[PDB]
Design a protein around this ligand. Sequence first.
Ligand SMILES: CCC[C@@H](CC(C)(O)O)[C@@H](CO)C[C@H](O)CCCCC(=O)O
Ligand code: NA
Lengths: 121, 120
Amino acid sequence: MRLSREDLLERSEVADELLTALLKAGVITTGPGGFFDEHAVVILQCARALAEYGVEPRHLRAFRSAADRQSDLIAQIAGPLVKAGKAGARDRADDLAREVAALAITLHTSLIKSAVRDVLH
Amino acid sequence: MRLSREDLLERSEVADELLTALLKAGVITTGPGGFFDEHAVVILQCARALAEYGVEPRHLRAFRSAADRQSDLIAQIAGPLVKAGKAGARDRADDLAREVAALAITLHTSLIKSAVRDVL
Ligand SMILES: CCC[C@@H](CC(C)(O)O)[C@@H](CO)C[C@H](O)CCCCC(=O)O
Ligand code: NA
């Protein structure tokens, strides 16, 4: 989805001032057309909950820098697979790259959960 | 959630060689108690599927590197909340620290999904 700023605030139930803080810290960004996506809703809701635990938007800036680097590693794997999707009537040619990107994200997420478990216990 | 190496191989359904390679490369590890967790099963499952698409275990090292650094940032945010847990009559409670850690991971995952969709 393509959400305006106001659409994002309504869906997230977060204050405009928190969104402004997250934008100015580079944590959240608009997509290339200047809209927000569905992930922005979740990011803003998590950021609000985290602010309530004393974590200010500027302290999430590292998460974003790391996410961008990981996204590039994932694109290296999935990008060349865009052309390899089945293109029959019933197919959509992007599905294979999406599947591969999703596997990589799941892998990565699980690695972080694992590493966190270990450092907190 | 405390899995032996055999439990991990049977649950993940991957070849012994793949696990061996992932261990050697540092991508998968046991916890401090010496065993594997439920996350290891998912990691192995995903790694096998990714291998089928071209991704060698060696190539997953960059993922592991990054995940460890992210866990260190998460520990810095969540670690101080261990002592703030709602222990009740107990001496300890890590539930707040776990919640903060879970939020942070969700946020980070969502940041990745957003960036991937943009790049692709
Ligand atoms: C939200 C759940 C995951 C997310 C995974 C992805 C594409 O970001 O890696 C996907 C679900 O597969 C969101 C979109 O529904 C997929 C549209 C195709 C875009 C793509 O190929 O990257
Ligand atoms: Na956009």
